[PDB]
């Protein structure tokens, strides 16, 4: 029971599966699409201190990954290099074939130390971390991501109507993921 949205005449209605209204025509798997949309586009605060308050560490929950075929240009991506004060890794290395988000104007690269009190870092509002055509529930080390969400669509029969430089800003942080966290941008 996941909302499947069917495009009508220049409109999007989520087709209700309990009833069966046949005027929708799906003649091929090419009409099926998954799309990633950025939370940025809804007006959420993008400042680093604001963004990092949405993430938190937790033990006991296995991570999960789901693919998507098409995405949105992001203005802001993030890239984390966080270690414990003795010097240890609190973010797991990217598995084979998880690469960074393809298109973002700004990559905010944050380095520093924190308590990292948990095995994996999750999104407190339940959104996803978007990578190159793979959305994950957790943050990987040293890999640029965007915050976003996934939708599934039945596209219309006509193909045609539907479907580069980057900069890095560096920050140092102490007490990352705490009530008061110290950042200095270089």
């Amino acid at each position, epitope marked *: 029971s996941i909302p499947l949205g069917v495009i009508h005449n220049s409109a999007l209605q989520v087709s209700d599966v309990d009833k069966l209204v046949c005027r929708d025509k799906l003649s091929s798997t090419n009409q099926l699409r998954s799309v990633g949309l950025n939370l940025e586009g809804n007006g959420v605060a993008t400042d680093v201190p604001s963004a990092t308050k949405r993430w938190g560490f937790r033990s006991g929950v296995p991570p999960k990954v789901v693919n998507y075929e098409a995405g949105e240009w992001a203005e802001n991506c993030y890239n984390l290099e966080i270690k414990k004060p*003795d010097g240890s890794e609190c973010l797991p290395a990217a598995p084979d074939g998880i690469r960074g988000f393809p298109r973002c104007r700004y990559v905010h690269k944050v380095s520093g*130390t924190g308590p990292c009190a948990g095995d994996f870092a999750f999104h407190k509002e339940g959104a996803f971390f978007l990578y190159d055509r793979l959305a994950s529930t957790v943050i990987y080390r040293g890999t640029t991501f965007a915050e976003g969400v996934v939708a599934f669509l039945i596209l219309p029969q006509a193909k045609k109507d539907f479907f580069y430089y980057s900069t890095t800003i560096r920050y140092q942080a102490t007490g990352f993921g705490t009530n008061e966290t110290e950042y200095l941008f270089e």
Partner: antibody
Amino acid sequence: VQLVESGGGLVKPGGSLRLSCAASGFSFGNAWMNWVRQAPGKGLEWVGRIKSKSDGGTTDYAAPVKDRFIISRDDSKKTLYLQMNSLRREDTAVYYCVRGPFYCDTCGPNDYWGQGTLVTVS
Amino acid sequence: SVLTQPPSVSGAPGQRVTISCTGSSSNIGAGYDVQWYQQLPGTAPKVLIYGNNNRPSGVPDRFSGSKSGSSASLAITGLQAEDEADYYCQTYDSRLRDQWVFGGGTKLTV
């Protein structure tokens, strides 16, 4: 694994001394190094830390000792150095170098601290 | 925000004792590990407990510990003559720019 710290000697108040901690037996280049001290009769104190080259290479210092001590390292000689200058009284203590991350599969005890070098100011 | 510790603890041979280390909401309850060191008179500290629960190879299982709220405990059961030492608890302060903080130390006697 060995940490050998040397260069502690009697010093007149206001003078300068240099301490070295030569490491062997482990991946020196991938560890964070700390200097701590213990004054006679009292407990342990932390003076400073230096990070690995791969993580910035920056140094932090405790508030009493900041601006008078400088910590550095040389990965070509595997040596940690603490330069003490403007050595005003109240710095008398045994100094120790502490090595890296505590998370070791097989390192075991007696592999994280040295033996201790006595520095007296008089 | 500096960790506290009792001046000294005592106990009969063969029994269990616990050493308390009490911190603050920025030190232990913020999610940082607590380490325990044993300094025998005349020598240098050796690592006894690291990462709140872990023991390095070679340390007897008589030594353990735990963390709760803003405090931590070290439990040693079966006191032997060789256990006389000064014990220190350590953690990372989060309001002091992630700098080491040490406990006052507790002397053990048998």
